Amino acid sequence: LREELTLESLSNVKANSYSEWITQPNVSRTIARELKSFLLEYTDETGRSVYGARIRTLGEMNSESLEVNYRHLAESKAILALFLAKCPEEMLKIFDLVAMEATELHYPDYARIHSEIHVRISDFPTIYSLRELRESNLSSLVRVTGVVTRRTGVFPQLKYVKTVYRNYQ
Amino acid sequence: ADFSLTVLRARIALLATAIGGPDYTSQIDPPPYKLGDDCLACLKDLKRWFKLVDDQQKRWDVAMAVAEYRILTDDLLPILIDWENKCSLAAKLANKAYYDKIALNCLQLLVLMTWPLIVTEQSSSNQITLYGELKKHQLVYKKTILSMESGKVLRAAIRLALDVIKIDRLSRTPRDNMVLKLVLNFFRNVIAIEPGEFTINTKKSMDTLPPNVSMDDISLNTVISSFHKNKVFGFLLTLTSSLSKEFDQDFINIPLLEIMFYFTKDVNQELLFPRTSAGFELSKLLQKEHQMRKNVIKHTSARHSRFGGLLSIQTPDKTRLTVSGSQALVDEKIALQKLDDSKKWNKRIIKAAEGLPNSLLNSQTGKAIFFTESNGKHFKEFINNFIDSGFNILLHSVTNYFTTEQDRMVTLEQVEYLLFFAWFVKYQLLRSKIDNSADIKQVSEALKEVTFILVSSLLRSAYDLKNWTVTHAGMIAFNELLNLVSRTKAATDIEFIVSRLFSDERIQLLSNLPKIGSKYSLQFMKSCIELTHSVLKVLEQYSNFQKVQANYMTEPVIETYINFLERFRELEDDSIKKVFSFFHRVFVQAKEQALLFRFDLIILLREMLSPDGLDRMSRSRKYVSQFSDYFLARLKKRLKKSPAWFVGLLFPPLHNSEVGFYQRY
Amino acid sequence: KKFFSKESFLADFDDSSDHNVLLNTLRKASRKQNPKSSAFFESMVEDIIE
Amino acid sequence: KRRPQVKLTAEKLLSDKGLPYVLKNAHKRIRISSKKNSYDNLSNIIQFYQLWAHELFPKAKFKDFMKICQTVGKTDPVLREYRVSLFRDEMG
Amino acid sequence: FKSRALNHVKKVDDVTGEKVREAFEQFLEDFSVQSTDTGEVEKVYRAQIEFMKIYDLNTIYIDYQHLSMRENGALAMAISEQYYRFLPFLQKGLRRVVRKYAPELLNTSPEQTERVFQISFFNLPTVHRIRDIRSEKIGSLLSISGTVTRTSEVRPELYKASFTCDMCRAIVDNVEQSFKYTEPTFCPNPSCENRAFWTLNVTRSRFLDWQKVRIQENANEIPTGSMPRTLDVILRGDSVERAKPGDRCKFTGVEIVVPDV
DNA sequence: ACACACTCTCCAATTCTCTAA
Ligand SMILES: [Zn+2]
């Protein structure tokens, strides 16, 4: 509950699988603290903190998606990049909940503009065509290229199962 | 509450890190672990969590917590192995006490977590809930302990013993003697943990190896290899053999009985003696498979399943039946059998042992366990040196204990003693049957008078209180003693021992025993048969005899013999030789023919003798057909002399005084 | 007949005688790796200044 | 109520359809020969008893017929009276 | 509570399987062919295991001629005529040998799941046509040839399954599938009776690669006045996407029978 | 409404145990 792990303590996965290690409360709190500490602190060579400059423009356009480069996340706190590649569906939930704290630090009451923010990953360093995908890739993050052959119309979809919706295509 | 539960789990987890950790300066990728502080208090409080809380509340929750945080695999083994390897290097060269303190206290937890599991109607609902899961985790423990550095933690446990071997018994304090009990108490558990037994609540009538475990991890074969490389067998051998010289016998010699039980269990002795070979016997077995295939083919139609016509069969009194299929057209035997087979009902049926680990008493032992060649020869060497070195000195001590302590016994110690006796006596008889280098003197402590009384007394007391499992084991032990006696008579005091073994009281008991066997499991009846064969054969070579044999011959014994004989598809070639020996005794010698004129015997001889059952060339058919020929000749004579026996053949014989005498003869 | 005495055993006990790339990269980097956050707050305060 | 169950009973055995038929015919039915195998002659004996058991009480498998017969055969006094009567007839 | 153990559970066992297992074991150990250049024993299958260890492979190739000359041919006959019965025993035999000489191969950081080895055979005595497939040969070992005409995309097939109950915190593991998607029969915790609302744990369960391909007879082999027949073939593991439409191929495996699911 | 799959319930058939002649 109260005590937190060091970053070096996370070097050893202690449970029988990654997902069952990320989802533990002390591990999860440690990851949240470390991600927030990365987002408030990463710099260009010129100082000039890029993510403090991106959150600033998020509100200038009344937007909903924060964009994070993977190479920056791999350049320090490397283990978090590894966990992201292995368990994206958990890691992105924690990362989204950190991004809202960081944006509200610039713009208090931004929750009245949009209730929830999505982190977009960029520059993932390995690529497949639609040949190389196999069962080992299941639930892993992947990067793919091709031509868009067909597109449906846009529809609303029920978000939770009082009601809320989201767009779908 | 759930939160109090997880608070204790978290307390344990924090203790699972306060313990220490490896070194990230090291640049040695990876190093070993490195040591914490308060760690004495950490170990001690964990010990308290077991003893002062979980035992007092009867939970097994604490064990579930330590299994969650993987304490055994993660810390205890490297703490011990580092202590061992450090001290090993120091010995190669040829506060330190504090290191040794940590070595002791890590081992005591290893004994505690791997301790074997018992469930009763007095265990808590918590323990009953957790039984199936902690079984999985203990299986993981066995695999891990045998695996690390090819099992090197087992050298740490014996080095601890070697400190207390070291200096004279005259010096050795009670606290000191507990180490020598503790070390052996460890190996008992490591052998005893084995795959689970499935258990459910009988509310409604409707594998447990975890994903990380497999059979070759857990097999007894593995355990042999592991102990041999890590130098255990020398320790058990040296320790048992010099046992008579003033090691205080009291602290060692029951734990040291349990080891010998716990890995004699699940071996048939013939597997240790041979009596391209594998390929040759495989080819022969494929011939047997072809014969079974031929048997199916002989009941298979040539043309397809919808070609089939219809058949009608007319009885006397002009009544008709209908059966389908093309083979029924030609084979009346098949038509008659197929006619009855359609009918729905079967009479529902009745059913003896619980509370103890799998063994000869409640499993079919016609199923070996399997050895590497190196393992086969190493195991043969271990028990051969044990027998030539240790057996008499061990049995003499453990028996003259139990005579002074019989009243206080518990069911397991009884069933251990009776299945350690049995194994070693039989194996030696077989070994000297094979070869002249071996001799019978090595097992000769079994015969002296005190042990004979004790096996007798166990069998007596078990029979009176209707405890059927001890009665079963005692039957097995008492069988071997008699077998050993006939050996020694085929070479003084032994006749005295016989005369005392065959006082009238015991003949009443040993005559009584097959009669009750009719109800019970297939092994129980088999024990009764083999004991009976031996019991009569000794008294045949005593030269009384006519009194004793008439004591055996009556309806409820014959009932057992047939009830056992009809399950012949499952039994050995040898046991049927024993049954027909007895029928030869009843029918030809004693001339008590009237017992066997009963119909369910006549069915049996058709099944077994048909092209269905006993092979056309097994030795069994010689005996069976030679018996049935004589049977039917005497039956013919009886039926024509007195036609009332046609209605006799269905029913039991009739016990009236005035007609019954002429009936039986 | 054998004997297997103590003193022999003590004496003989002692004397006897591609993600494959990326995983290695990230593990080694992981092993190798308020004023610090001032640049962030400076970017926030520049809205006040400019 | 549900329909009561139908069973083998000593009344069926003591009926004229029952056991007297076997004693009236068995001497004529079965015939052994040394000129045929043990298995041959052994098989032959069971034929008549099987067909008779079916004709008497078709409920159940042949073995179950024999084993059912044991209970009533040992317990019922009237059946035992009939049986001692048979063996007295031979004592006559 | 009326707790009760399955005291009667002790299973029936096939002796032929265990003897085939520990005979195939000895063949893998000591086939002991001499060197291509010299009269020196080489032990090629142990060397092949070492090669697999060096490159983290998952399949082993065996020559049917080498098996034919072993132990008067009885082992080869048993494998040939009853492959479907004996394939699990062959797997069990190989697992022990790889444990003995290369335990690094048994696993595929947290814990690592076991490697699903594949045995493969080649150089069989004769090749059949698609027109020679007949129901008497079901489950035997064969080799076939033809021209490829279609191929399917690679799909994941469920091999072993694991489920967890909705009404209580309980888990079921290592459920076996065969031809249709299959789920547990009871809640293992006796404090709960719900049979519904299982969910398949995608992390703990295990899958395989699977591909369907379709072939037709070689044009030069068609008999007089007749037309070419076709067949559907299954590919799994490290052999998917090896085949190409319009090419000519040779296959080996066992013919099977598939139900109306 | 018409064959099916599945659940629930009650009643008597059966075997086991104790007592006395
Ligand atoms: Zn449930």
Side-chain angles (χ1 to χ4, degrees):
Chain A
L1 287 173
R2 298 181 182 89
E3 66 294 324
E4 302 185 1
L5 277 65
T6 74
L7 183 57
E8 300 95 305
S9 305
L10 298 178
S11 303
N12 40 245
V13 176
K14 296 257 55 191
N16 62 276
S17 78
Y18 282 99
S19 178
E20 290 162 305
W21 178 237
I22 306 310
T23 194
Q24 303 195 13
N26 52 357
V27 173
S28 181
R29 282 180 172 187
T30 307
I31 288 171
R33 177 248 290 159
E34 287 299 313
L35 284 165
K36 189 183 179 186
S37 304
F38 152 80
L39 197 59
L40 292 170
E41 186 272 345
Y42 184 83
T43 71
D44 188 55
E45 298 188 325
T46 61
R48 191 181 180 274
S49 181
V50 54
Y51 291 105
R54 282 184 180 185
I55 282 166
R56 200 207 82 217
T57 293
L58 192 160
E60 289 168 345
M61 307 302 157
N62 215 66
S63 191
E64 184 172 31
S65 290
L66 178 59
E67 185 166 53
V68 174
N69 194 307
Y70 185 88
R71 294 178 184 170
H72 302 165
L73 184 57
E75 185 167 45
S76 64
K77 310 191 187 292
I79 185 161
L80 304 178
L82 179 58
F83 291 173
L84 179 63
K86 285 285 181 184
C87 284
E89 192 162 60
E90 301 294 339
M91 202 61 43
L92 291 171
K93 290 182 181 183
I94 287 81
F95 208 168
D96 289 347
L97 294 170
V98 164
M100 183 59 85
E101 307 303 323
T103 207
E104 283 206 314
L105 193 56
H106 266 57
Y107 297 115
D109 301 342
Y110 196 76
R112 303 176 73 176
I113 315 291
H114 296 283
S115 190
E116 184 168 35
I117 282 177
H118 300 159
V119 169
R120 307 290 169 202
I121 297 298
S122 178
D123 291 331
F124 188 74
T126 182
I127 300 175
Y128 302 110
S129 194
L130 303 179
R131 301 285 160 170
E132 302 94 322
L133 299 174
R134 298 287 179 271
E135 104 296 13
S136 59
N137 301 120
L138 288 167
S139 193
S140 181
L141 204 74
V142 299
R143 180 176 171 196
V144 169
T145 174
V147 171
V148 287
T149 297
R150 172 165 53 182
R151 186 182 74 176
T152 73
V154 178
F155 302 93
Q157 182 188 51
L158 177 61
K159 191 173 178 182
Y160 176 76
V161 285
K162 294 188 290 183
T163 184
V164 182
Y165 300 86
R166 66 184 176 206
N167 311 323
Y168 172 99
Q169 180 177 47
Chain B
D2 311 316
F3 52 84
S4 311
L5 160 64
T6 55
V7 163
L8 176 49
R9 291 167 45 190
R11 191 172 181 89
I12 287 162
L14 264 56
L15 292 155
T17 60
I19 184 159
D23 184 284
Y24 295 26
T25 79
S26 61
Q27 173 56 90
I28 285 155
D29 306 330
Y33 196 97
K34 135 189 190 188
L35 307 174
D37 294 289
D38 296 359
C39 290
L40 165 57
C42 300
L43 298 187
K44 182 166 286 193
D45 192 49
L46 180 60
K47 191 188 177 186
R48 292 191 307 199
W49 278 113
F50 299 114
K51 183 58 178 173
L52 184 54
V53 168
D54 199 301
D55 174 23
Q56 309 313 305
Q57 297 191 27
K58 294 181 180 179
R59 317 197 63 77
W60 304 343
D61 295 328
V62 167
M64 177 49 57
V66 317
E68 173 183 354
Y69 306 116
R70 292 146 55 91
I71 310 190
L72 196 177
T73 55
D74 297 11
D75 297 85
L76 284 149
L77 304 197
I79 293 156
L80 285 186
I81 302 151
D82 291 357
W83 170 83
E84 142 62 359
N85 252 312
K86 282 286 197 77
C87 230
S88 180
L89 291 179
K92 300 298 286 195
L93 307 193
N95 175 71
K96 301 183 180 181
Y98 183 101
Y99 284 128
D100 303 322
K101 296 312 301 293
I102 224 75
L104 194 309
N105 288 304
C106 291
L107 162 62
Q108 192 176 155
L109 308 198
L110 277 169
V111 164
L112 181 61
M113 297 176 284
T114 58
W115 187 284
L117 305 176
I118 55 178
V119 285
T120 78
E121 298 90 328
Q122 300 77 21
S123 311
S124 75
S125 61
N126 204 99
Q127 296 168 313
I128 290 160
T129 302
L130 277 174
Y131 172 80
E133 300 174 348
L134 201 59
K135 251 287 180 187
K136 303 179 177 181
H137 295 172
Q138 287 194 324
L139 273 151
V140 183
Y141 289 170
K142 179 169 181 180
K143 172 171 180 169
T144 305
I145 300 154
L146 291 157
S147 299
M148 211 78 69
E149 303 100 344
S150 67
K152 179 155 177 166
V153 48
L154 301 183
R155 276 179 110 249
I158 105 183
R159 193 187 293 284
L160 270 174
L162 279 205
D163 191 40
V164 186
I165 280 184
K166 194 175 281 170
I167 62 173
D168 306 355
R169 104 260 84 253
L170 181 57
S171 76
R172 295 201 291 243
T173 299
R175 172 167 290 276
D176 204 8
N177 268 282
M178 297 306 90
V179 168
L180 230 174
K181 196 176 86 158
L182 177 57
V183 176
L184 281 153
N185 216 9
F186 176 5
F187 298 121
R188 188 189 79 195
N189 318 273
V190 157
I191 302 147
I193 280 151
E194 74 196 330
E197 278 291 356
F198 202 71
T199 292
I200 55 173
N201 188 10
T202 313
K203 195 199 302 180
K204 189 174 287 186
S205 308
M206 300 297 179
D207 188 8
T208 51
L209 297 186
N212 296 324
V213 172
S214 69
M215 289 301 292
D216 271 8
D217 308 327
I218 298 304
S219 171
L220 182 148
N221 178 83
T222 299
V223 185
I224 304 311
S225 314
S226 190
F227 290 15
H228 174 66
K229 290 193 73 166
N230 299 266
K231 309 297 186 272
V232 198
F233 294 162
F235 176 59
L236 296 160
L237 281 178
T238 189
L239 183 60
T240 184
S241 189
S242 58
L243 166 59
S244 81
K245 300 309 187 69
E246 309 193 62
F247 298 62
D248 180 12
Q249 307 158 11
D250 307 7
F251 305 124
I252 301 95
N253 66 358
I254 277 55
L256 186 48
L257 182 90
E258 272 137 46
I259 294 179
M260 305 315 307
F261 169 37
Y262 264 110
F263 63 67
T264 40
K265 214 177 67 163
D266 299 335
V267 181
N268 298 332
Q269 295 80 69
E270 298 88 352
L271 275 281
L272 316 187
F273 288 110
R275 180 40 190 77
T276 306
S277 302
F280 167 81
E281 66 181 32
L282 170 54
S283 181
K284 193 181 283 291
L285 182 60
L286 292 178
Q287 311 315 303
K288 303 299 182 73
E289 289 282 71
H290 179 49
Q291 305 323 298
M292 298 299 292
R293 172 164 60 201
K294 189 176 78 190
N295 294 339
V296 175
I297 287 289
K298 285 166 68 63
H299 295 86
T300 299
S301 301
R303 285 176 152 108
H304 58 80
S305 61
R306 287 184 170 101
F307 188 85
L310 289 172
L311 177 60
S312 185
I313 300 174
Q314 70 183 29
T315 58
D317 198 6
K318 297 194 175 181
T319 305
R320 280 180 176 179
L321 299 309
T322 59
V323 299
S324 60
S326 50
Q327 283 300 124
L329 292 169
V330 59
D331 286 335
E332 290 167 21
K333 289 75 168 181
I334 295 179
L336 296 154
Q337 202 108 349
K338 186 179 179 78
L339 172 58
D340 212 45
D341 201 14
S342 166
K343 300 173 188 169
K344 284 178 160 68
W345 149 279
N346 294 59
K347 190 172 171 63
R348 71 182 318 298
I349 302 299
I350 292 145
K351 295 180 180 177
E354 211 84 86
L356 189 57
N358 288 314
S359 56
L360 291 61
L361 310 198
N362 55 260
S363 71
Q364 207 290 312
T365 197
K367 168 177 176 170
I369 214 162
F370 307 96
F371 276 65
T372 82
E373 294 63 39
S374 52
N375 275 355
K377 248 57 193 180
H378 278 319
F379 191 68
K380 243 201 65 167
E381 283 290 342
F382 172 53
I383 40 169
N384 201 108
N385 283 287
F386 182 93
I387 283 171
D388 290 315
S389 185
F391 185 73
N392 304 289
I393 172 57
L394 190 57
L395 200 74
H396 182 76
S397 177
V398 61
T399 203
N400 293 131
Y401 183 125
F402 282 163
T403 47
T404 74
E405 208 82 351
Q406 177 166 211
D407 57 328
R408 294 162 168 187
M409 277 193 152
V410 173
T411 185
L412 185 78
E413 304 187 353
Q414 293 169 313
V415 168
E416 265 150 12
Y417 186 57
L418 300 168
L419 300 194
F420 157 74
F421 185 116
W423 208 83
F424 285 99
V425 176
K426 165 163 43 173
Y427 168 84
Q428 188 78 351
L429 297 198
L430 197 143
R431 196 157 63 89
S432 275
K433 164 68 168 184
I434 277 284
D435 186 51
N436 311 83
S437 183
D439 312 276
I440 306 311
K441 283 298 193 183
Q442 312 299 54
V443 302
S444 191
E445 163 59 339
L447 300 186
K448 316 305 282 290
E449 183 166 43
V450 180
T451 303
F452 133 81
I453 291 176
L454 183 50
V455 180
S456 296
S457 176
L458 267 331
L459 172 52
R460 167 70 71 197
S461 181
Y463 177 50
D464 286 11
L465 277 75
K466 313 299 168 69
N467 186 354
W468 300 120
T469 304
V470 174
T471 293
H472 190 178
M475 205 186 303
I476 308 173
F478 201 87
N479 178 12
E480 288 299 342
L481 193 172
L482 262 153
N483 208 340
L484 178 62
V485 159
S486 81
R487 203 73 161 201
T488 58
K489 216 181 192 188
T492 55
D493 310 312
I494 286 54
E495 292 87 298
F496 185 73
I497 291 151
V498 156
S499 72
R500 298 176 37 64
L501 274 152
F502 285 77
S503 47
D504 190 286
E505 304 169 7
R506 297 152 189 281
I507 317 303
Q508 186 129 237
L509 175 46
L510 282 82
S511 303
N512 186 283
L513 210 46
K515 295 177 183 174
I516 64 187
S518 184
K519 305 154 185 174
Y520 295 75
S521 72
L522 167 56
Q523 266 71 28
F524 194 109
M525 301 187 297
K526 201 174 82 84
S527 296
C528 288
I529 284 171
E530 298 204 40
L531 168 57
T532 296
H533 182 208
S534 287
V535 166
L536 284 149
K537 199 162 72 185
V538 176
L539 296 189
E540 189 199 349
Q541 62 168 234
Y542 115 113
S543 173
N544 297 87
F545 182 59
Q546 265 51 49
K547 298 288 192 179
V548 171
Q549 177 147 243
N551 201 282
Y552 264 107
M553 285 173 182
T554 167
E555 193 75 42
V557 160
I558 289 286
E559 183 60 32
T560 71
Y561 273 55
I562 284 151
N563 272 253
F564 165 87
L565 187 61
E566 95 189 349
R567 290 184 65 169
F568 70 90
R569 288 172 212 291
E570 313 188 17
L571 307 181
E572 306 298 348
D573 286 331
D574 208 86
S575 292
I576 280 83
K577 155 166 150 61
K578 262 165 267 288
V579 166
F580 283 99
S581 179
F582 184 76
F583 287 160
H584 188 261
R585 186 111 65 166
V586 161
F587 203 68
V588 159
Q589 295 190 32
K591 299 210 77 175
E592 315 286 351
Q593 279 140 223
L595 290 323
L596 310 182
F597 300 160
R598 27 178 289 143
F599 216 65
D600 60 7
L601 176 56
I602 283 181
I603 301 178
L604 177 65
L605 300 170
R606 99 187 275 260
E607 292 186 346
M608 171 182 293
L609 182 51
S610 172
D612 163 81
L614 285 175
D615 174 68
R616 287 183 182 178
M617 276 299 309
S618 166
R619 296 181 175 277
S620 194
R621 271 191 184 257
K622 291 290 204 74
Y623 255 27
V624 173
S625 200
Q626 199 265 304
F627 178 60
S628 294
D629 271 326
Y630 189 73
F631 183 46
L632 281 171
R634 297 309 301 191
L635 188 58
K636 175 187 169 70
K637 189 179 183 182
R638 179 53 52 91
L639 291 204
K640 188 150 73 170
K641 186 170 176 190
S642 189
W645 265 105
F646 285 118
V647 157
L649 252 60
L650 262 69
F651 303 151
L654 185 62
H655 298 265
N656 166 255
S657 52
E658 63 171 48
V659 285
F661 177 73
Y662 177 68
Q663 167 173 107
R664 269 176 171 155
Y665 301 87
Chain C
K1 186 175 178 182
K2 331 296 185 177
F3 188 56
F4 298 98
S5 66
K6 165 190 174 184
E7 295 173 30
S8 67
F9 176 53
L10 296 171
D12 192 53
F13 180 34
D14 297 320
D15 301 353
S16 295
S17 58
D18 187 5
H19 188 253
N20 292 275
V21 178
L22 183 58
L23 177 60
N24 279 280
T25 303
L26 291 171
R27 290 282 181 83
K28 288 178 179 182
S30 184
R31 108 188 175 120
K32 191 176 182 181
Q33 287 162 7
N34 167 274
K36 295 183 181 179
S37 61
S38 186
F40 184 96
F41 289 104
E42 286 158 38
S43 76
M44 190 197 304
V45 167
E46 283 155 25
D47 296 329
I48 309 171
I49 291 166
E50 285 183 346
Chain D
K1 289 186 175 294
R2 62 263 193 83
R3 184 173 61 142
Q5 306 300 349
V6 179
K7 314 180 191 180
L8 188 147
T9 177
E11 300 187 340
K12 303 301 298 187
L13 309 183
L14 271 56
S15 75
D16 187 68
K17 164 70 178 294
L19 312 199
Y21 179 90
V22 199
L23 190 44
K24 225 284 197 176
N25 295 288
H27 69 311
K28 274 169 174 182
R29 288 278 78 211
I30 300 178
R31 237 172 311 292
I32 317 305
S33 76
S34 183
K35 303 181 179 180
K36 292 181 172 62
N37 314 317
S38 58
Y39 178 55
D40 305 359
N41 290 270
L42 185 73
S43 304
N44 192 298
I45 274 161
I46 340 123
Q47 297 172 246
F48 166 41
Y49 275 88
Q50 191 157 72
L51 297 174
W52 162 87
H54 178 77
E55 289 279 58
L56 246 295
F57 183 68
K59 179 200 168 177
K61 299 167 165 74
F62 194 33
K63 292 163 59 181
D64 288 43
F65 186 93
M66 301 296 155
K67 299 213 300 182
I68 286 162
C69 282
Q70 307 289 16
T71 60
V72 175
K74 187 144 63 178
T75 49
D76 176 29
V78 183
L79 177 51
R80 281 181 284 126
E81 184 178 1
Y82 176 49
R83 293 169 64 186
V84 295
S85 196
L86 294 166
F87 283 74
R88 177 169 306 97
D89 306 332
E90 270 286 72
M91 290 190 83
Chain E
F1 300 110
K2 300 181 180 181
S3 56
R4 175 183 56 76
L6 282 61
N7 186 285
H8 60 294
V9 69
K10 271 276 185 169
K11 291 167 169 296
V12 178
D13 297 287
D14 193 342
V15 177
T16 63
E18 301 298 348
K19 290 194 185 302
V20 167
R21 171 193 185 180
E22 303 196 344
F24 180 64
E25 182 186 298
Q26 296 170 62
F27 167 86
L28 287 176
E29 280 276 34
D30 294 312
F31 174 58
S32 61
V33 67
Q34 292 197 128
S35 172
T36 306
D37 56 11
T38 47
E40 67 191 7
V41 176
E42 195 156 37
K43 302 202 180 189
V44 294
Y45 292 109
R46 193 183 288 175
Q48 192 181 160
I49 291 165
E50 189 67 32
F51 191 96
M52 291 171 60
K53 162 173 165 289
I54 289 159
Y55 300 107
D56 301 334
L57 304 179
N58 64 5
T59 186
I60 187 175
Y61 295 90
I62 302 183
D63 188 329
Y64 189 79
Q65 296 197 340
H66 295 177
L67 239 168
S68 299
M69 61 185 76
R70 182 66 186 200
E71 288 166 31
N72 200 32
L75 179 57
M77 182 184 71
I79 291 166
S80 171
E81 306 314 281
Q82 299 187 351
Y83 190 102
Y84 191 90
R85 172 155 77 146
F86 291 123
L87 179 64
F89 290 104
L90 267 48
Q91 288 278 18
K92 283 180 177 178
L94 177 137
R95 281 291 305 265
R96 185 177 291 158
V97 173
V98 178
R99 179 197 290 269
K100 183 172 176 180
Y101 293 100
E104 297 179 18
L105 278 167
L106 262 57
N107 302 92
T108 48
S109 300
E111 310 302 339
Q112 293 156 240
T113 57
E114 301 197 321
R115 189 177 303 260
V116 280
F117 292 91
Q118 180 200 56
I119 306 102
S120 312
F121 300 87
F122 66 101
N123 211 113
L124 281 160
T126 187
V127 174
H128 299 158
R129 308 165 299 180
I130 293 161
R131 186 173 297 269
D132 302 320
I133 289 177
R134 304 291 294 266
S135 62
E136 65 182 332
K137 282 177 169 69
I138 283 168
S140 66
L141 176 61
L142 306 169
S143 69
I144 275 151
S145 181
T147 56
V148 178
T149 176
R150 285 186 182 176
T151 63
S152 194
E153 64 183 51
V154 186
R155 307 181 181 277
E157 188 204 335
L158 179 62
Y159 178 64
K160 289 174 182 279
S162 58
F163 305 90
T164 180
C165 189
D166 183 53
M167 188 60 185
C168 71
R169 302 292 74 76
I171 286 173
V172 186
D173 210 342
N174 295 308
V175 179
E176 292 290 344
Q177 298 298 305
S178 76
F179 293 109
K180 80 182 195 295
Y181 171 63
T182 299
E183 300 187 325
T185 62
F186 52 70
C187 180
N189 182 3
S191 191
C192 170
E193 296 295 336
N194 167 60
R195 269 68 174 179
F197 307 110
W198 293 111
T199 56
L200 183 275
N201 186 304
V202 172
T203 304
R204 288 173 174 251
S205 58
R206 299 193 68 175
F207 295 83
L208 286 172
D209 292 311
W210 179 101
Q211 187 183 34
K212 169 75 87 73
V213 309
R214 186 168 175 83
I215 60 177
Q216 70 179 5
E217 290 176 280
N218 295 323
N220 60 299
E221 181 51 31
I222 300 167
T224 70
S226 195
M227 290 187 153
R229 291 182 181 166
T230 70
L231 181 69
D232 278 16
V233 182
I234 308 300
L235 300 174
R236 297 210 293 192
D238 287 48
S239 62
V240 300
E241 283 284 8
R242 197 79 64 151
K244 188 175 182 169
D247 197 13
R248 270 192 180 210
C249 299
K250 175 158 57 181
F251 299 81
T252 177
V254 303
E255 57 161 301
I256 64 174
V257 137
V258 179
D260 300 326
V261 172

